[PDB]
Amino acid sequence: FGEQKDISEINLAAGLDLFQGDILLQNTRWTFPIPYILADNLGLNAKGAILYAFEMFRLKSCVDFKPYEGESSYIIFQQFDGCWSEVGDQHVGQNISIGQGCAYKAIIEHEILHALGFYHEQSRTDRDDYVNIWWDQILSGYQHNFDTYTDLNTPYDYESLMHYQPFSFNKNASVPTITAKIPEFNSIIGQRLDFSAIDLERLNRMYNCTTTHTLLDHCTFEKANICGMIQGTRDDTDWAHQDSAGEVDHTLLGQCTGAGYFMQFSTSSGSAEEAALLESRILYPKRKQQCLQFFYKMTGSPSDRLVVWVRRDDSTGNVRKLVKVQTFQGDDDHNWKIAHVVLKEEQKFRYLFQGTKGDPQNSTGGIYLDDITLTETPCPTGVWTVRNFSQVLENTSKGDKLQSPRFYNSEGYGFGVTLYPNSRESSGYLRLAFHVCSGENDAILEWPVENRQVIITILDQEPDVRNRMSSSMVFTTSKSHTSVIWDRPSRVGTYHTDCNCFRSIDLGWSGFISHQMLKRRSFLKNDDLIIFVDFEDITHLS
Amino acid sequence: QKDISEINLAAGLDLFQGDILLQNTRWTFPIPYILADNLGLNAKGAILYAFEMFRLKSCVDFKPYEGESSYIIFQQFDGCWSEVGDQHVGQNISIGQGCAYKAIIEHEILHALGFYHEQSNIWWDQILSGYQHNFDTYSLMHYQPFSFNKNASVPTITNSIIGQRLDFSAIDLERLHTLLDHCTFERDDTDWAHQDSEVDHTYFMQFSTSSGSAEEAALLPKRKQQCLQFFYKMTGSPSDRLVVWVRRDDSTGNVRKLVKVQTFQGDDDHNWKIAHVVLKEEQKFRYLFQGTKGDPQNSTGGIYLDDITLTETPCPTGVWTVRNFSQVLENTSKGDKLQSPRFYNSEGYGFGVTLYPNSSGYLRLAFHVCSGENDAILEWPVENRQVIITILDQEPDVRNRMSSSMVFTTSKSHTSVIWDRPSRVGTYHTDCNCFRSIDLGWSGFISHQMLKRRSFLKNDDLIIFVDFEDITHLS
Amino acid sequence: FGEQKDISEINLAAGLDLFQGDILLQNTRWTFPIPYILADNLGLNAKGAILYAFEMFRLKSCVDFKPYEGESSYIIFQQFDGCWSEVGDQHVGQNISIGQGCAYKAIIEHEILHALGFYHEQSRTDRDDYVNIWWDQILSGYQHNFDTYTDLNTPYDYESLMHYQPFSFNKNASVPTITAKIPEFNSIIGQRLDFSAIDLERLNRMYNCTTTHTLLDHCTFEKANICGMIQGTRDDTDWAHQDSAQAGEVDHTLLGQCTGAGYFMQFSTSSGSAEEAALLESRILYPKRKQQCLQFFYKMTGSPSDRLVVWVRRDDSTGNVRKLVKVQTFQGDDDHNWKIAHVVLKEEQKFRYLFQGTKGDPQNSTGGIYLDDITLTETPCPTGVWTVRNFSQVLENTSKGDKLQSPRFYNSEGYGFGVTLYPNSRESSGYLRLAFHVCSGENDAILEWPVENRQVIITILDQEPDVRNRMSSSMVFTTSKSHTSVIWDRPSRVGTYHTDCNCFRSIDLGWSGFISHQMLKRRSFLKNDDLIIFVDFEDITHLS
Amino acid sequence: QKDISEINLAAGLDLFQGDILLQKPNTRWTFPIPYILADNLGLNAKGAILYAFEMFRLKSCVDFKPYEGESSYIIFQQFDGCWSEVGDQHVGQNISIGQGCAYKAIIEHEILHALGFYHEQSRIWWDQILSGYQHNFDTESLMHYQPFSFNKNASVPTINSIIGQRLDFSAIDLERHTLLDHCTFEKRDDTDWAHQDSAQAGEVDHTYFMQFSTSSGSAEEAALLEPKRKQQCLQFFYKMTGSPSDRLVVWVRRDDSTGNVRKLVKVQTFQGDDDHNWKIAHVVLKEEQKFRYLFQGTKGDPQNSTGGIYLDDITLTETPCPTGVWTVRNFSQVLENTSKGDKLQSPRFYNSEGYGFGVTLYPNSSGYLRLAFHVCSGENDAILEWPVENRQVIITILDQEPDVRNRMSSSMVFTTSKSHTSVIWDRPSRVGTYHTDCNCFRSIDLGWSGFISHQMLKRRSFLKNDDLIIFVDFEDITHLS
Ligand SMILES: [Ca+2]
Ligand SMILES: [Ca+2]
Ligand SMILES: [Ca+2]
Ligand SMILES: [Ca+2]
Ligand SMILES: [Ca+2]
Ligand SMILES: [Ca+2]
């Protein structure tokens, strides 16, 4: 794929001269939902990436989008030269361009923020206060892209998705055109992760947003009211709200004395098959599917059991009907784990955790919970936790590699992630690459695999899913990838002993994230690197 | 189970032909219906079960009475009766206590749909005085041999079929929504072979596993939910595997998106078997069987399929197949018993069936609740859950089936309360490592003559379906 | 004054039988600003208390209030029997009653939340999951006030100002009618401090609020961008940003409870040349009133010759922020603990606040200037501020009816006054008593006596840096000729002499149960073991 | 400072009566006069014109406002010479303020022409006039021709020591908005202020005076004696012979917003010391609604007091107060005892932005007094901008006359600029000389060697009480750029 280029490099290479690089110039605030059209010229990877960007907006703001219906104003997405947009609505159909390199989540989010009404962060009048502009290092004629002019009463943000990178319109790669007056920020400006917390604040103050479209419930256990959860009465005992005073919480990891709370069910005493029930408050879903994400730990007997249940409506408006959803079992890990459970609730319901004592005569520990989130989105297909990443990074040379355990999609395709901690082609970067694995389904499946989107995402472990800045990369499997890479691994795959399976050649972004960035933004919380991977058919957008 | 003529005689009624109230005349579907508050919750659940049978075997449909010129209201005021024919005005149907059995309910509804009795030799000298007019002239709709009878030693009508209470006969259905597909058979590496009687369960489809490479394979709605039923056999390696897949629409009108639904793994029972798979398809789709070779050298047989059906109904919560039932019925004295495996419902209650092949001249089934790993999250005593026990008619076409069924609702009135948490009221059995409740059921569930009568004992297998569902929402 | 009564007791004493104790049941959301009328029957203390409640709404939400002027829907405040309101926007007229005894901040805030559209927390459909109703302990014929009657995806709030106290409609004072299922919350339910965080979240979701009318700036320094502040270029050095991990350093935001987190600004005075300085400066701020209060925490361990100067830079009338004006000077002294400062600004045009540090004699200084927890609000600064050191040790070492007295403060007119604190209240076991008194001073000959129609507002500062999440306890009264033992005549006549001020103090008047000890220990009121009290004393004759 | 006739002669101009432009029924202005300050007009000249307009508003009903497109507007520009068109032309008309015309009395002259006036010139030493110019003599006043105007030989006047003054308007020039209150006293508390008639030796008025005695009664006994702009200056003369513990407090009572004036705000406190002479006080008021000023006298120690508090000559103007004030006692003795180049230095004064400054006085400059401004290092220096530029120095010798119509205060103005070198206005610790009296560096003095003549001081009331009172102002005018 190659290193992701900045929008200013793309539009310069495309021979454009729009105002401020990506802004085109031919009462101006939208009324939600914004009508959209994905045009036929727009490539399949770009269509998929645009719909992934819309899910981020719904998870983090009140912004929403719909297919066209004969409405007054609308956004048409097309594959023209360069990445560009027209700032604010303009009352008859406006056009966003995404083409020949623009198909990245953060670049599409950027072009949509222009259409919502935002200008560049560095375009504000008070740039001369926060950043230096090296005018002698800007390319000839392109100085006009650094001119200024709108009072939402908010501070200047170096993390803003709407900021230029240190090397924008730059005549020699050795010397940046922009530098921060606070030196720590020189490696922050022009990030391509996600919306900053100040970007979401400004979007919400401009559009009177007070709630998001796809977040139902969120609980870190840090308030004594336990987020309005309730304890069972028909069960033998109760969950204790503990305060981190030989264990640490996942919200703060014991870095704070007193602060830091988690729920515990002690398995070291009492009768076998005694249980404790923790239940949510009544929730009202707005989609057919939800993902319950939580962090848990087990140290007791292997026979101890954390079961996830739903109690849903009886169709008469009484929340009485139980259903058993997933079971987690005790083992030898003894560290905090991430769990995902797919719910499918179409009517009002509650989520319940049932801890149960398996062998209390041979247990000296228990079950722990922290950091719950419920979203109205699909759950990540594969999740890979690399323990002790800092030590992995210090013990590996350039071009040493780790491989995930084998994973499987809904159709039954097998796949995995290869991690190189010290990237061969990019010194000081981590390289992630995607490979297909042979499996028990290879005869019912189609080959070569095509039109499936791969989404790889490094999780920012921030407890509030709104403020997470997770790094993501996306691609679509195509016959144009040759060495065809995606043919049945049996014919061309390099055999591996650890799965008794054939792995395809791996085609992945050489620079996924810098080592410097990995250190910050809670990505390596607990020194665990957490990678999400999705592999899904997008042929229906064609 | 008492007869309708007995129930109405015991109620002290004197209706036309024993169960008709005499106060064009054909319905327009769906029939608008209202369930009265007086009507029992157990009766309401049984009435819904009867409605499902009507939709499955006939065009007849039932809808809530939001507004219509004519409709049916079900009452428990006095005995069991139904005015014959649509009255052009809202009519009335009575479901007497002791007549909640599904058969009795289907009978009353057949009168509302317009039927008179099938009999309408008669021994007039054996009839009760003052009831001879119920035998005047002018199947589920026939009198029993001892209807209005004065002396149990002699019948009023002459035999063993008449006044059956299984289901609609094929003639009752001929004289009168939820079936999608049915078949008796009469990109992948290899094909399934269509083969002839290695005897058919009804022709059958065979995928051979005795040759070639490992992991070679062969491939063969109006509501929200469906049940796929099929018969299968495996004789190859225990490594061999039958997989059930759905291919569904991607919403562009293209059935392409695969989803894996169930896997069946080879095992040492080499007989034919019955499987149920729940499909949850809300758009157009296909069901696919993937056969796959697990270890060809070790394998000396194949995978076989026969008697497929797909219905828009919930799959049975547990299924038990008692093998060599003729030999079981011979090998058991009165009060010898068999117990099913430990099944579970959606709420996680554990349960089973106890069978006593010699009850006199009847088989006896009884339901019991087993302790399970969910006993702490569950509610006790269990109430307002309906139990359905059914003996399957193995007839492959679901329209033609006359499956025996019985029903009851768990209630604090059942004492010896039988339904409290089994660890406190029940007794420990080593064979499940579990506590079993007292067993409650019917001493007369089916006659030994009946099991022989309608191919229930095909392959000498007896197949029992059991369901245990919360019906509190009807209250 | 006595103990503050609950709204249920006040209406029950008035013999009323309203819906849910305080609702009158004669598109239903308001359009801001809400038109209001303060009726002629409404007493002077109630008028002053209602205007004080409107300033809380403008600090914590987008709610705002304006004069009648002939609009179709308006709130009329009147002095009928009981404390009660209608619910929502009638669109014709709405009466809210601030009866006798209703004139306390949190009661007026409650009635205004009813008019904004809120019902009680203990009447929700899910309630029976979260609290127990002891039906045998309710008074005969009042059980309808605990019946169940709006879904915003918000959880059940025990802290809600809209929740009933444990003894509401109770037949026996020893047994509660309500108890929380989570047992810690039994002393939280029915609090009368302020809006909870969840109360404000629900108010803001229901009205599409994203900002507040009277907050201009806030900064705790916990983000490395220093909340949009900038360093000076014309000065001699820079302010550092320090992490509280070093021995002998501690941030005011988290007080080292967290480790590897907690930040403050430092200017070192332990080296360099005399009269070197450093500037730290705000973003460009746009005021919407004539007056502002800058509140910040500071500490000075350096030479008593070191100086912290607050400056403003304001617009020159060309639209360029260039004109400097000097505002306040703070000097080094021997109290090395954290201190609270308040500086009044009077800016009518866009401006920037600046802190200048200055090194005086670094030859003999081993310390420096420290800053944390800045806030700027469009409200008048507190007239007097009293910090009681080691309060937990004071509370343990004092007996019942021992006392402490504040320094002597002055109001704008020049009246001298102070606060008397009794840590272990005589009349209210487990409470702290605060009481006001007037002190003789150098202005007693120009001032009017007996002092009447002035309003006293006493507040205990919650110390939470983000002003939207403070739950400060506040109490109010108006000086009146009825107060006799007249208490408010010139202190040299009616007072007693005190050797500590060489002055005369009036008889002290206030609330014996000002706050419970359990409440002070729960929230940030005793942060660092400093208790911070604010007091105000202003003329409200113009509301008459 | 040169005369206007010399400035227009140096420009080589030949205008009607030397400074009137004639462009060709009855014409006369209707106030306020609309005006424009042109972009070509230098920064010192813009500031000097605005100081001249405050004199018009302080002394007359004349007023000035910005352009609104009416038929008549006056545009001020930097052409050659100082000149004007007499009276309203009924169209836009121009005033020229050339190089050297920035002095207030020259601007006041050109404006008097714009209002409509002619010189008092009337039927002169013809043999002393420059060849050809004789027509400019055809037929205290500011407009009166200077004695040496249109003169061929500096040894002899053409036209005695009063004529052609450049102080201010005479009373007669005013005879041909910003004063609120004025009193010379000549026409809840414990006791009263005594109106007193100067009948006791050693107790004489500054002009009758108001007296609060401190030699009897109890301590802390008191007596009380009780707008079109946002800001006002209360000027008064006071004296305090009593205890150093005695106080004079200035208080304001303002409208409470019901229309009743009851609220009291403490404004300034003045404290007794061992200077028993009359002092001049300035108190800034900031009143936007109706109000009363109050003086509270208070007895500090009646057991160690043999005197009192005295007040005289109150005035209240809707203008900023003077930034710094200096009172040179016994000037007549100073002027006799000093030689050429002996000096006195003012106490350090601070503007609103915090720049430290002062004045140097040389009493014998020949026969003139020399005043010069300097910047002093102070506690703010690190935070201030340097070199200081675009701040306007005004130095004024107050004519002590209590009625503000009758004052003729000598005033000079300049604007700090990088062009001033010997840059004089850089930070005094870099470019100045250190002094032990202030413990501070002082920048090089810049000012006028001929600020006023010793003759002019005697004629006016500047030397009342043998006090010379100097006012100084140092304010940012960058916004006029
Ligand atoms: Ca936690
Ligand atoms: Ca067959
Ligand atoms: Ca801090
Ligand atoms: Ca600096
Ligand atoms: Ca008096
Ligand atoms: Ca006088």
Author numbering:
A (entry chain H): 37 to 62, 72 to 194, 200 to 295, 298 to 535, 542 to 600
B (entry chain D): 40 to 62, 72 to 168, 177 to 194, 210 to 229, 236 to 253, 263 to 272, 284 to 294, 299 to 303, ...
C (entry chain E): 37 to 62, 72 to 194, 200 to 535, 542 to 600
D (entry chain A): 40 to 63, 71 to 169, 178 to 193, 209 to 228, 236 to 252, 263 to 273, 284 to 303, 313 to 331, ...
Quote the study on this structure.
The zinc-dependent metalloprotease meprin α is predominantly expressed in the brush border membrane of proximal tubules in the kidney and enterocytes in the small intestine and colon. In normal tissue homeostasis meprin α performs key roles in inflammation, immunity, and extracellular matrix remodelling. In contrast to meprin β, meprin α is secreted into the extracellular space, whereupon it oligomerises to form giant assemblies and is the largest extracellular protease identified to date (~6 MDa). Here, using cryo-electron microscopy, we determine the high-resolution structure of the zymogen and mature form of meprin α, as well as the structure of the active form in complex with a prototype small molecule inhibitor and human fetuin-B. Our data reveal that meprin α forms a giant, flexible, left-handed helical assembly of roughly 22 nm in diameter.
Our data show that both the zymogen and active form of the meprin α ectodomain (i.e., the region released through furin cleavage) is capable of self-association to form a flexible, giant helical assembly. The zymogen form of meprin α is plugged by an α-helical pro-peptide that sterically occludes the active site. The pro-peptide forms a small helical cork which plugs the active core and thus sterically occludes the active site. Accordingly, the steric occlusion of the active site represents the major autoinhibitory mechanism. In a single asymmetric unit of the helix, two meprin α subunits homodimerise into a C2 arrangement via the M12A and MATH domains. The dimer interface is most extensive (1374 Å2) and highly conserved between both meprin α and meprin β. This interface is defined by the M12A protease and MAM domains, which are dependent on a conserved MAM/MAM disulphide bond to form the covalently linked homodimer. Two identical MAM/MATH interfaces (610 Å2) each provided by two homodimers together drive the head-to-tail formation of the non-covalent helical assembly of multiple homodimers. This latter interface is defined by extensive charge complementarity and salt bridges between the MAM and MATH domains and has a calculated cumulative solvation free energy (ΔiG) of −5.2 kcal mol−1. The MAM and MATH domains buttress the protease domain, forming the outer structure of the helix interacting via a head-to-tail arrangement, while at the dimer interface a conserved disulphide bond stabilises MAM/MAM interactions (see next section). This arrangement of dimers forms an indefinite filament which coils into a left-handed helical ultrastructure. Cleavage of an exposed flexible loop, defined by residues L61-L67 located distal to the active site, releases the pro-peptide and exposes the catalytic core of the active site.
